[PDB]
């Protein structure tokens, strides 16, 4: 009541309803995510449809939608349409459908054939291009990892990277610390561009070796001894000169209490990558080292990484990450 009748009924008649425009029943693939096709077969394109969890629009959802509505870049997933269901106050988001992702692509190569070196380069370049676009608009990702790196299948965007956020919980919550920068594990309270860049460094290493570089065996607190231990086993323990402001990290004293640098005297990234048949004099290695720098102010930025001579060295990166070759990776399974 109390609202104009002619206004209400006219809007109800004209309002697009997601169930009228799209077929998606029994096509769940992941709130809840569906593979969807139009009923009025104007196009034969696949779509991804997400019903946002809860009802109404939360602060998190509001700001998220607000930004996606503005963000436009080939390497960032694009929001095509929003649907508002008034009966149940549910919100649906529509995206162009991405068949693949780096999580599944990496799993494929870890199982008994390594990732082709041209593909690795091309993937990294588009991830950097995508994150540079966000970063230049002062938008941070805060949860980069292979599962949030989508790759387009057959179609006019064949082999193009799309950075995304698949709605994993963030930090009693389930999550992985493998891509999390040391400053966060030492109690940094604010997310930064450098933190995104660390995660990209981790992903790069993983594309090169097929294994997560800081792999380590539901939680509440940020400090994680074992994850730090794994980082030191790989990187070595950082000297004062390498990271002076480490003293200013809130968990620094805890670090001193639990860790002796002598434990890690034989450790370094060079030795770790050699074991995995990546040569320390390769352009790839030197770029990796710069991304995986322990002191966040000494990590290079996305733009600087994009200008690295690595991407000028043969082979050049390609728009289609698959390089015209057939795609051996399987498609998504319904649930």
């Amino acid at each position: 009541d109390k609202m104009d009748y002619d206004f209400k009924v006219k809007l109800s008649s004209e309002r697009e309803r997601v169930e009228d425009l799209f077929e998606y029943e029994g096509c769940k693939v992941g709130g809840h995510v569906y593979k969807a096709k139009r009923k009025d077969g104007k196009d034969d394109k696949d779509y991804a449809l997400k019903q946002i969890e809860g009802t109404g629009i939360s602060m998190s959802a509001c700001r998220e939608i607000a930004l996606l509505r503005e963000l436009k870049h080939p390497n960032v997933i694009s929001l095509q349409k929003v649907f508002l269901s008034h009966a149940d106050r549910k919100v649906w988001l529509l995206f162009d459908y991405a068949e693949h992702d780096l999580w599944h692509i990496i799993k494929f190569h870890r199982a008994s054939v390594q990732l082709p070196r041209g593909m690795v380069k091309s993937l990294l370049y588009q991830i950097l291009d995508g994150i540079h676009y966000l970063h230049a608009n002062w938008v941070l990702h805060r949860d980069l990892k292979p599962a949030n790196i989508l790759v387009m299948g057959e179609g006019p965007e064949r082999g193009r990277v799309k950075i995304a956020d698949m709605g994993f919980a963030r930090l009693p919550v389930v999550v992985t610390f493998w891509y999390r920068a040391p400053e966060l594990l030492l109690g940094a309270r604010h997310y930064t561009k450098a933190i995104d860049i660390w995660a990209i460094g981790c992903i790069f290493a993983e594309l090169l070796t097929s294994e997560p570089i800081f792999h380590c065996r539901k939680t509440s607190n940020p400090y994680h001894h074992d994850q730090l231990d794994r980082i030191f086993n790989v990187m070595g323990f950082p000297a004062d000169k390498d990271w002076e402001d480490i003293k200013k990290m809130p968990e620094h004293s805890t670090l001193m209490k639990d860790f002796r640098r002598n434990t890690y005297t034989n450790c370094s990234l060079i030795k770790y990558m050699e074991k995995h048949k990546v040569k320390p004099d390769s352009k790839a290695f030197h770029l990796l080292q710069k991304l995986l720098t322990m002191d966040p102010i000494k990590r290079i930025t996305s733009e600087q990484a994009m200008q690295d001579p690595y991407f000028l060295e043969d082979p050049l990166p390609t728009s289609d990450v698959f390089a015209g070759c057939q795609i051996p990776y399987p498609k998504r399974e319904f649930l």
Binding site: M3, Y5, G56, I65, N137, W138, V139
Partner: protein, 267 residues
Amino acid sequence: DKAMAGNFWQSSHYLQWILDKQDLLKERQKDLKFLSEEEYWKLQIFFTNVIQALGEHLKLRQQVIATATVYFKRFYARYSLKSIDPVLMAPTCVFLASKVEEFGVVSNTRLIAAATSVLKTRFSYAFPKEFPYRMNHILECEFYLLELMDCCLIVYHPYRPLLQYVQDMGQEDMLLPLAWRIVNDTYRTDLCLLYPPFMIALACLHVACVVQQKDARQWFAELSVDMEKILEIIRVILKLYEQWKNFDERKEMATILSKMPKPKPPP
């Protein structure tokens, strides 16, 4: 620095929400059957002030109040005042804009308490009756507002560019406070719907310079900008202060509110 801060020329604000004056006035004709043009702009001022009051009571920053104000304006730029009660729409706009940044979900009890208190203490000359809406109405109204705006939530405002301009002048202490308050006052008009925020910033700064008798001609002359469009904005600003002088909000507004078209009920 703010998210999307440098993205205006590709933004939804610029591309979808800078309207043509004639389209605007055409849609206005619907309500002008009930209200004169004068009463319509007096109503606009009135609801600008309601939204400012709500914002202040909730301790929100001025940008949030501005964003809420823009939401409200975009809605009645397309639709009649009878479509949804502006008394409901106003706190709905504040509520949605607060959620656009961090620290934002104003609690239910608090939104309603704010709207109730503000009308009772600051607007009893217009509203003899208590705020009659509850949160389920707010939430219904939110969905209509979001739909109308096609989920374009990010709004740019003249404050940021103004600040950059006065810093370049080296006159931040002298000119900013007045220029800032004049920007606030532009929200009493249609300006934010018609011009990019940086142009409004320049017009406000120009009027501030005049008022304070500061020569900035050379600085302005060094600008690469359609100065004819700036003069347009300056005229609206000068007019607004004359309207302000002649308008007695507290004596007139109850009568003006009773003339607003009424919502048709159902069968």
